[PDB]
């Protein structure tokens, strides 16, 4: 703040002050000079500070509106992300079997917990120990949920492949033990 009209008036007031006080003349001179200094600092009491308030309010409004622009930008971004996720998830389900089991529903409104129980293709079985492996995932195929499942890969905790041979009664205490059995719907 230096190129200010009130500051130019302040400057010429100080100039007349130093001039007419350097040539010391009368008391009226000093009186008018002090009054002029007062009016000059009255000019530069506001033109020096109120414009700083203008500046601070402009800056806070500008920063706020930048942050608002950021808000709307990240808004559009998360919108795009959500919709692409929805589309890619959908493009994995539309087997006509689903359409079929929905048609055979008298109103179109079916429960959810049975959709993967009928129309899903892959199975994942988690078995705690050997004895449970005996009762349920035996041979290269087994029957669950009224369908046949052909076993296709087995892994352990570290997820390291385990052929069906190693699941011996006696080899058992040599692997991690929640074993993950992946299967496929036979047909």
């Amino acid at each position: 703040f230096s190129s200010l009209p009130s500051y130019a008036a302040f400057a010429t007031a100080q100039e007349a002050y130093e001039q007419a006080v350097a040539n010391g003349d009368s008391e009226v001179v000093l009186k008018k000079l002090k009054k002029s200094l007062n009016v000059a600092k009255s000019e530069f009491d506001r033109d020096a500070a109120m414009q700083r308030k203008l500046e601070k309010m402009a800056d806070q409004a500008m920063t706020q509106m930048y942050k608002q622009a950021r808000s709307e930008d990240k808004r559009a971004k998360v919108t795009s992300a959500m919709q692409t996720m929805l589309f890619t998830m959908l493009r994995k389900l539309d087997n006509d079997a689903l359409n079929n089991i929905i048609n055979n529903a008298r109103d179109g409104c079916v429960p959810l917990n049975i959709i993967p129980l009928t129309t899903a293709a892959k199975l994942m079985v988690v078995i705690p120990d050997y004895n449970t492996y005996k009762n349920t995932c035996d041979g290269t195929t087994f029957t669950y949920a009224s369908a046949l499942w052909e076993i296709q890969q087995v892994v352990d905790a570290d997820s390291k492949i385990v052929q069906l041979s190693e699941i011996s009664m006696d080899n058992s205490p040599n692997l991690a033990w929640p074993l993950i059995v992946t299967a496929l719907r036979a047909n």
């Binding site: 709307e72 808004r75 959500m82 917990n113 905790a157 929640p178 993950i180 992946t182």
Partner: protein
């Protein structure tokens, strides 16, 4: 969801060797002593999450005695008529820490700040209006806690999606904040224990009984064994404050949403979705308050069973038979409410069984001779009630009892009470368990809390918590506090030393000397500000 189940593990804590060396140098941790190390950072191995989610098998279908329930619900409601609730617009909610997790699937794209910052007030009010007419099931995620404890079971907390909290807030916040700002009530949530708060709370609960004894109990597996009916009852009692804002169908749909979101919804433990059978999910929008409601319910039910299961002819006072007789009336013979009976019975309870309730953690100051005769409830009634209405067996090794009414509570909110003469009168004070404070001092989460130089502030907080030990008649106990003070002094000295060393400056002014002098601390417990 994805092709391989994830196995989550829990790491062990971190050791602060400097403090341990200090404490053994000053003669602590002696063999056979009382104070010791009992609180550690227990580690868990692979299938920890699922082995703790499996604890829901203690939740079984439970059918409630409908008539006595329909009466106790009225009395419980009467315990709750000093507050005010109702819907509020989006531009009046108060969210502290907008920087927490936003549940599953939202946590893939930022914290709650994003969604609370990308939806104008119109969208939020529209979402509310929508759930007032529809149902939105949600997914809940299960997270493993990592904090000090004294029992080596894992602990989990449920993280509810943003769609649930963003609306439950607008539905309940007015009543919640109105509860958290009332003094002298029965529910004591929001009442600070500093600056004499403990004394006022104890005096209020004491409150004019005749032959006072104390008593406190404990629910085993509280959050996993609560049956659905009492949870629904609690939600209804909370929503009772909505007679004008909402219309009737709106209230039912809000009930349905809250049920389908926090009572029996899918849970994303591990990496797969399971089905939660029942019981609360400790992390929703209104846990502590609903637990308080359920607590008061069980207390009232026990009093009712006590009074009804006693022989009439053995009753001396005519007014008490009148009470028991007409209570059987209003329970089974009648069909609809009778306000005056409820009123005078509630007043009777307020005279013979005063209570202090924080969430599932109670203290009771009750007549003793009435209890002996069988006109209020003693521990045995609580045991029977929990058995047939909660499906758990409350062992009597966890239910304390007190006779002299001058040594407080035995224990409430895991604090003990001591009656100390301060200034010129005799006030109550709370003091923790010393092994807890020492454990907190020695074992820290991250390795930057293991360099006392940077973090003196937490030692200040710990000392503020440890102060009231100084008034204990024992002797190791006061030495705890004094050890903390001398530690703070040592830290400040070595810090100035280091600073002068690496650069050569000395600080100009500190005003830290008030931290190792024991009036700054005692200010907290005596009464002003």
């Amino acid at each position: 969801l994805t092709n391989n189940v994830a196995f989550q593990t829990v790491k062990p804590g971190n050791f602060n060797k400097d403090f341990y060396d200090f404490a053994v140098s000053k003669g602590f941790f002696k063999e056979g002593s009382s104070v010791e190390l009992k609180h550690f950072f227990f580690a868990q191995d692979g299938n920890a999450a699922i082995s703790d989610y499996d604890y829901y098998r203690y939740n079984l279908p439970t059918m409630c005695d409908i008539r006595q329930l329909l009466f106790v619900v009225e009395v419980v409601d009467k315990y709750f008529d000093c507050y005010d609730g109702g819907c509020i617009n989006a531009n009046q909610v108060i969210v502290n820490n907008l920087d927490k997790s936003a549940g599953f699937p939202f946590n893939k794209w930022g914290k709650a700040r994003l969604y609370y910052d990308s939806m104008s007030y119109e969208d939020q009010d529209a979402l509310f209006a929508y759930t007032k007419r529809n149902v939105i099931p949600t997914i809940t995620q299960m997270n493993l806690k990592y904090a000090i404890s004294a029992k080596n079971r894992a602990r989990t907390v449920a993280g509810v999606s943003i769609c649930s909290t963003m609306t439950n807030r607008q539905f309940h916040q007015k009543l919640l904040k109105s509860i958290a700002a009332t003094r002298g009530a029965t529910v004591v949530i929001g009442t600070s224990k500093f600056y004499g708060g403990w004394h006022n709370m104890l005096k209020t609960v004491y409150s004019d009984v005749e032959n006072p004894h104390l008593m406190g109990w404990d629910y085993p597996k509280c959050d996993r064994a609560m049956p659905n009916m009492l949870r629904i009852m609690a939600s209804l009692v909370l929503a009772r404050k909505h007679t004008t804002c909402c219309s009737l169908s709106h209230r039912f749909y809000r009930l349905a949403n809250e049920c389908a979101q926090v009572l029996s919804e899918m849970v994303m433990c591990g990496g797969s979705l399971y089905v939660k059978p029942g019981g609360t999910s400790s992390g929703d929008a209104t846990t502590a308050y609903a637990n308080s409601v359920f607590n008061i319910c069980q207390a009232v039910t026990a009093n009712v069973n006590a009074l009804l299961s006693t022989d009439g002819n053995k009753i001396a006072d005519k007014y008490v038979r009148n009470l028991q007789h007409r209570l059987y009336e209003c329970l089974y013979r009648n069909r609809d409410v009778d306000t005056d009976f409820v009123n005078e019975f509630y007043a009777y309870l307020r005279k013979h069984f005063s209570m202090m309730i924080l969430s599932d953690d109670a203290v009771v100051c009750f007549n003793s001779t009435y209890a002996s005769q069988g006109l209020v409830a003693s521990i045995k009634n609580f045991k029977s009630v929990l058995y047939y209405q909660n499906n758990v067996f409350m062992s009597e090794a966890k239910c304390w009892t007190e006779t002299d009414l001058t040594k407080g509570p035995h224990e409430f909110c895991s604090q003990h009470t001591m009656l100390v003469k301060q200034g010129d009168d005799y006030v109550y004070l709370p003091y923790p368990d010393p092994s807890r404070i020492l454990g907190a001092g020695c074992f820290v989460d991250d390795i930057v809390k293991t360099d006392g130089t940077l973090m003196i502030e937490r030692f200040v907080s710990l000392a503020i918590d440890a102060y009231p030990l100084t008034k204990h008649p024992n002797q190791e106990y006061a030495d705890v506090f004094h050890l903390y003070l001398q530690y703070i002094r040592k830290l400040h000295d070595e810090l100035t030393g280091h600073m002068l060393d690496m650069y050569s400056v000395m600080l100009t002014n500190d005003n830290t000397s008030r931290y190792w002098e024991p009036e700054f601390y005692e200010a907290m417990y005596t009464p002003h500000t």
